[PDB]
Structure 1
């Protein structure tokens, strides 16, 4: 074990290896640090009360398992994870180390003037990262501009901050469908993409109902084919209950957009999530011709997430998390 030191920042104590220097608050509780081992600047996150409830303990464990697993350019990965605790008995705090990236995409959006080439490169990187995420059988479910770190050269990493967020949510997530396929995230890529083109939010709903009213205005009310898949009572029984809305043709909404951008949007923003384009399929769309490389759009190693079914005690989830701290191997 290295030697640690204690420092107080914004009413939060922080005990970190001497390696991590220059500490200064950024945000949960995140600091910028200077990593003297690799000469680069990092974000260090100290987890708040990680083993306080069962649910906190399980989420702490999912955090670590998940970040230990993500190893892709366009997805947040773990540079390091440490605890000041010398033993399990004494184990209480968890710090995560990741790359700091300057902005999130939210900053970059409303003040900069995005070329079609900007939208290609930014959207290409989200899909690329999503292929990877989705190949591990992970659905993000809350993809938005705040959850995309962008550096100065417009390199992009997907992440989860986590806890308006509703502006990018798939219609099915917002009616609480419970059977979600991965294309929920494709819906989110559509909303983001449209906003990078127009510079404005596609569905800036004021609340839940308004959000959905705005979605249907664009995509139209459900067709016969989609309707025939709805199991439920009055889930379907309020059919045209917000008028029998005709679907907008997107060439009319995205005037002066690359017609290939328009065509991809039509394939992302389908009501019926069985008809949505996949991440891997969207990669092969002519819109990404300048960036698409078939041999450098990698998939994930098998991700064991049996643990999610498990109902364990606070102290089992704490031990499991301890094991994960102990077993961490740093990137090259």
Structure 2
């Protein structure tokens, strides 16, 4: 056990090892810090109320398990995980540490008007990280520019997976019974469109508005999609929405690389069964200059059987404690 010093960052008490100096809030709570062990800037996240409820306890365990499993260049991974506690009894706080990239994609789009090459590299990396995430049978579920950290060389890492409404898949704007991994592809589509235009694709004011804007672009469900709607009332709620014809993306994203438009058409399909997968997208001609089938790795099997179980708070906290102790830092 290293030396743990205390500090106060905005009404919040922070107890971390001495290797972590210069804590600075960046906004659980997160603080930027200097790792005197590597000389690099890191992001330290202190979970709020880790074990306040069963749901909170399970979520804490979930996040720790996820982060400990992710080992990919384009996915946030764990540099360290610690707790001031010295035993299971005092165990009450969880701190996670990872690379601090510099900025998020949201900030990059604000100022800089990205070139086609930029959007190729950026989207390529997101898909490369996604292929890895999806290979572990994990769904991000909330991909958006603020969840994408980028460094000075525009290298990217995906944050907060497996845990605005502008990038959410239409099926997840409805409580459609069990969605697949392509909900993440829909999000990538929305992100790509925005990196290309500099404008939000579907900037809905609220829930209803969001769906209306999506339908104006991709049109109302065709016959083939309708045939798969098991719910009768949901089937009418669809047709009750103004009939919208599918827009030709070429006429929407004027001046964009034709291959970019083609890819967007394959990601922004209303029917999730017809959406391009991450692996397929990586082989699309749009990424010819970045694609390397021998350098787009997949993950080791991820045991997530814990998701189906209902345990007591102390049980979830004990399991979380076990994961903290069993942690082996990167090379």
Contact 2:43 2:99 in 1 (8 A): yes
Question: 1:21 maps to what in 2?
Answer: 21
Contact 2:66 2:162 in 1 (8 A): no
> Counterparts of 1:202 and 1:79 in 2: how far apart (Å)?
35
Describe the superposition over 1:120-163 as per-residue Cα deviations: whole angstroms up to 9, x where unpaired.
00000000000000000001111111111111211111112899
Instruction: Give 1:238 deviation, angstroms.
Output: 2.8
Q: Secondary structure at the match of 2:272?
A: coil
> Counterparts of 2:45 and 2:157 in 1: how far apart (Å)?
17
Instruction: Give 1:178 deviation, angstroms.
Output: 2.8
Indicate how the Cα distance of structure 1 residues 239 and 20 shifts in structure 2: closer, same or farther if over 3 A, else same: closer
> Counterparts of 1:161 and 1:265 in 2: how far apart (Å)?
22
> Counterparts of 1:239 and 1:19 in 2: how far apart (Å)?
56
Instruction: Give 1:242 deviation, angstroms.
Output: 2.4
Describe the superposition over 1:30-61 as per-residue Cα deviations: whole angstroms up to 9, x where unpaired.
11111111111111111112111111110000
> Counterparts of 2:162 and 2:135 in 1: how far apart (Å)?
22
Instruction: Give 1:239 deviation, angstroms.
Output: 3.6
Instruction: Give 1:240 deviation, angstroms.
Output: 3.0
Describe the superposition over 1:178-203 as per-residue Cα deviations: whole angstroms up to 9, x where unpaired.
31000000000000000110110111
Contact 2:116 2:196 in 1 (8 A): yes
Of the structure 1 ranges 39-48 and 263-272, higher mean CA displacement relative to structure 2 is found in: 39-48
Contact 2:106 2:145 in 1 (8 A): yes
Describe the superposition over 1:207-234 as per-residue Cα deviations: whole angstroms up to 9, x where unpaired.
1111111111101111110000000112
Q: Which runs of 5+ in 2 are unaligned?
A: none
Instruction: Give 1:28 deviation, angstroms.
Output: 3.0
Q: How many residues align?
A: 331
Contact 2:139 2:162 in 1 (8 A): no
> Counterparts of 2:120 and 2:62 in 1: how far apart (Å)?
32
Question: 2:216 maps to what in 1?
Answer: 217
Q: Secondary structure at the match of 2:239?
A: coil
> Counterparts of 2:88 and 2:208 in 1: how far apart (Å)?
48
> Counterparts of 1:296 and 1:169 in 2: how far apart (Å)?
29
Q: Secondary structure at the match of 2:59?
A: helix
After TM superposition, the structure 1 = structure 2 runs for residues 88-237 of structure 1, keeping only pairs within 5 Å, are 88-160=88-160, 165-237=164-236
> Counterparts of 2:197 and 2:22 in 1: how far apart (Å)?
40
Indicate how the Cα distance of structure 1 residues 162 and 43 shifts in structure 2: closer, same or farther if over 3 A, else same: farther
> Counterparts of 2:269 and 2:285 in 1: how far apart (Å)?
19
Contact 2:121 2:290 in 1 (8 A): yes
Instruction: Give 1:93 deviation, angstroms.
Output: 0.7
> Counterparts of 2:253 and 2:325 in 1: how far apart (Å)?
51
TM-score (norm 2): 0.98
> Counterparts of 1:11 and 1:61 in 2: how far apart (Å)?
25
> Counterparts of 2:44 and 2:162 in 1: how far apart (Å)?
16
> Counterparts of 1:74 and 1:239 in 2: how far apart (Å)?
37
> Counterparts of 1:206 and 1:191 in 2: how far apart (Å)?
16
> Counterparts of 1:238 and 1:34 in 2: how far apart (Å)?
53
Of the structure 1 ranges 235-244 and 126-135, higher mean CA displacement relative to structure 2 is found in: 235-244
> Counterparts of 2:91 and 2:153 in 1: how far apart (Å)?
39
Instruction: Give 1:21 deviation, angstroms.
Output: 1.0
Contact 2:119 2:196 in 1 (8 A): yes
Of the structure 1 ranges 270-279 and 229-238, higher mean CA displacement relative to structure 2 is found in: 229-238
Q: Which runs of 5+ in 1 are unaligned?
A: none
Of the structure 1 ranges 17-26 and 121-130, higher mean CA displacement relative to structure 2 is found in: 17-26
TM-score (norm 1): 0.98
